[PDB]
Symmetry: C2
Subunit: 97 residues, 2 copies
C-alpha cells in the first residue's frame, strides 16, 4: 500500500538523542524486519529487537488512530543511566512523521 512515515526517537551509545526517520510500507515490510534493518544499520540496540518491533506493529495497524507511543527499552535495563521516560533515557518514542 502507501508507505507510513515514522520517527523513532532514542539515544545512542554517546547518550545523544536522535530522530531516526524511516518508512514502513504495509504488505511489503514487516515490523520485525524493519526493526532488524535499524539494528543492522547500527541505529538501534539489538537487545531492543522484539520491543521495537512490537511497538512498530502497534502504530502501523491503525496509524490514523495511534500517532505516537513511548516505551521502555530492554537495552536500558542493562545500562547505568537512571531511566526517565520524559527525557527518553532508557525509553524510546515512536511516532508518525
Amino acid at each position: 500500500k502507501i508507505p507510513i512515515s515514522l520517527v523513532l526517537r532514542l539515544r545512542n551509545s554517546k547518550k545523544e538523542l536522535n530522530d531516526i526517520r524511516f518508512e514502513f510500507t504495509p504488505g511489503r515490510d514487516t515490523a520485525e524486519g524493519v526493526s532488524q534493518e535499524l539494528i543492522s544499520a547500527g541505529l538501534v540496540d539489538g537487545r531492543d529487537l522484539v520491543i521495537v518491533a512490537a511497538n512498530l506493529q502497534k502504530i502501523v495497524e491503525e496509524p490514523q488512530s495511534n500517532r505516537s507511543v513511548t516505551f521502555k527499552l530492554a537495552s536500558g535495563v542493562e545500562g547505568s543511566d537512571i531511566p526517565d521516560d520524559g527525557k527518553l533515557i532508557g525509553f524510546a518514542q515512536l511516532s508518525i512523521s
Copy 2:
C-alpha cells in the same frame, strides 16, 4: 494497593494545553468508569468516552513498559482548525505521571 498515576493532556477551545491528573487502581477501577468520571467532571468530551477508555485500558495493562500514547479524538475539530497531532488539536496524549 498503589494506584497508577496518569495524566491526560488536552488542548481547550482557547488553544491552551491542560494536563488532567487522575488515578487508576487495578482490580477496582475500570477503564470505562474512570473515563466517565473525567467526562462527568467536564474535562473530557462525552464523544471521546470510547477512545479514551480504550487507550486507558492499554496503558494500565503494562504501565512499566508503555508510558505514553497519542491518539485521535472522536470529538474532532471545529471552525478553521484542522487535526494536528503535534499540537494536540483533535488528538490527546495519555501518559503515566
